[PDB]
Amino acid sequence: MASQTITVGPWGGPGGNEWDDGSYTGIRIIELSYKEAIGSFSVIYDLNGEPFSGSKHTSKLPYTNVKIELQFPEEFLVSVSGYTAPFSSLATRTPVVRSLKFKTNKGRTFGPYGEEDGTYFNLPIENGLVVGFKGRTGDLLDAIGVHMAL
Amino acid sequence: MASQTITVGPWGGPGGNEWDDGSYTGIRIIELSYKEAIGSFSVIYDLNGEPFSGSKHTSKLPYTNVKIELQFPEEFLVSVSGYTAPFSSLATRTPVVRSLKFKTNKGRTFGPYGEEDGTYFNLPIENGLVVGFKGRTGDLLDAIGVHMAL
Amino acid sequence: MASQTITVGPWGGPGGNEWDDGSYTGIRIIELSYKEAIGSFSVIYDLNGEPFSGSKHTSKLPYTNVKIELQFPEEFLVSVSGYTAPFSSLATRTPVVRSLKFKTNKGRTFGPYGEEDGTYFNLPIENGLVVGFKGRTGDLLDAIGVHMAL
Amino acid sequence: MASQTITVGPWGGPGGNEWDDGSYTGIRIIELSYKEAIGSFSVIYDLNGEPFSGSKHTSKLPYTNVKIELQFPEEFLVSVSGYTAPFSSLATRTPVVRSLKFKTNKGRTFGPYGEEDGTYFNLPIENGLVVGFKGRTGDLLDAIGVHMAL
Ligand SMILES: OC[C@H]1O[C@H](O)[C@@H](O)[C@@H](O)[C@@H]1O
Ligand SMILES: OC[C@H]1O[C@H](O)[C@@H](O)[C@@H](O)[C@@H]1O
Ligand SMILES: OC[C@H]1O[C@H](O)[C@@H](O)[C@@H](O)[C@@H]1O
Ligand SMILES: OC[C@H]1O[C@H](O)[C@@H](O)[C@@H](O)[C@@H]1O
């Protein structure tokens, strides 16, 4: 196939429908919505020094919207963490992403957003960069994973 | 300025002495000891098709020794997981690696070894290989981290 | 700072103005113009399975246009080669790219385009993929280099 | 399969017997022998901060031996270049490695060794590191290629 990157995760459940943004050169902006779990999730990547908009992974729920704006390129993620559990408001009870938190190399923290409820996942990055996301979304964020590169 | 890989981790605490095995072409044998926590941890890497013995990180503790023999190259790790916590019996209450578990692409599970107490960590690898480990060792395994390559 | 790739070259001289398309998932189309030397050079990359248009590095000179359409992703480049040297009136001081030739994994050759004069350059790729180009262009393609991944 | 690197080449002919040292962390020492072509060729690699000897690819011919010692890790190769052509004093008139030259980031040039006859090859490295060699040896060095990593 084409060029490719190291992929970790997914954390979360087998619900909703798969999506993969693919890889890019870094991250500029993450946009998510949240209440008791994570709803929407959408990313403005850097591609070779300019913004590139990933597909929107919108949840239909009326959740609070946040926009995490990184000082790209000198600021970048060193950690992604959160929790996974079901959220009872569904017909199926499969685990979903209840919370996300992000930390950066400058010591900014974004989140937690959502409810720190369930099982903990934590991706600390000692060397390397986050360069794309993938997940599964239905009414909300069922699962999340990350692509990495040097 | 020597060649680098993606490194994730570490998971555990600031105790003991740093070690870094660096990177190789894959994993052949993992060797560890356990009881209440992980003591010893050593690895036989693959280096360009032949075994390469990593440095030993051995604990003096009279622990149970286990040898994890992967059917290299067809079988490789797809998950590293475990638990970190203080171990009350150290002259310090700093967190160490209480448990480890390993899963492979053939569906085998090795562990849990040690005791599942404290904060869970989990690295599921969807695409990528483990090519090295780094860590910290005092009397026990204080921290572990993993290098990944395509 | 941002994601990086293996970069080889440049081949050619220090004239014209520098450009770098950066890196992508692979190559779909190369468009160039030629006569005595290479003029125009532009690329349609694959970005995560969709085409992405590289910046245009156009020559005004009335040269022959060629479009090289690979059957991506099954078909890819396995060799970039060419010749560099000064050219007559337009590039008297410094070498420019006089010719380019490309080989693919399916045994297609595209070119030589231009004239085979001066100093030979040859990049046979045994493993890895071309994921981007860089260069310098004035009236002509003064230089070219390649980013590679995998 | 297991971990891989980008590999460019080969330069030279199809004669002799193939060898492939694989990949490591970097380069400490190149040893070669030369007269009107390249004879012997062997490398002491860096592996995670200690030397690792590659297999000797020695020529029995009465040539001049040369040890290229880099100031590892701060000094590394940025260029491998040379010439290939058949060599009169041989039975098969396939091309062999006639000359090699090596440049470093420190500004040091080692070579040219042998004789600059036949077809030029030239790998300038703008980003990335040489982390192994592969080749072919009979009574002389028939071909050479390079593995590269970030
Ligand atoms: O997004 C959570 C939930 O949303 C909908 O109910 C469906 O798409 C489920 O599969 C999914 O698990
Ligand atoms: O390894 C567990 C423990 O061993 C010793 O007590 C010391 O090296 C500590 O720093 C360390 O935490
Ligand atoms: O591109 C060929 C030639 O075109 C112009 O003359 C300038 O932009 C030069 O610097 C360059 O070398
Ligand atoms: O290496 C030079 C030359 O030496 C030997 O004669 C053989 O292995 C040839 O195939 C090879 O071309």
Numbering used by the authors:
A (entry chain C), B (entry chain D), C (entry chain A), D (entry chain B): 1 to 150
What did the paper state?
FTP was also co-crystallized with mannose and glucose; the crystals diffracted to a resolution of 1.70 and 1.60 Å respectively. By studying crystals of the FTP–mannose complex, a water molecule was found between mannose and Asp139 consistent with their lower interaction. In case of FTP–mannose, HBs were detected between Leu90 (C=O) and mannose (H–O1), an interaction not observed in FTP–glucose. Therefore, mannose is better surrounded in the carbohydrate-binding site and is also stabilized by indirect interaction with Asp139 through water molecules, which helps to stabilize the sugar in the binding site.
The FTP structure showed a β-prism I fold, which is found in Jacalin, Artocarpin and other lectins giving a high structural similarity; except for a few loop areas around residues Leu90, Glu36 and Lys106, some of which are flexible and adopt different conformations, even in the same protein. In contrast, FTP binds carbohydrates such as mannose and/or glucose in a different way, paralleling CMB and also Artocarpin presumably reflecting the high sequence identities of 90 and 91%, respectively.
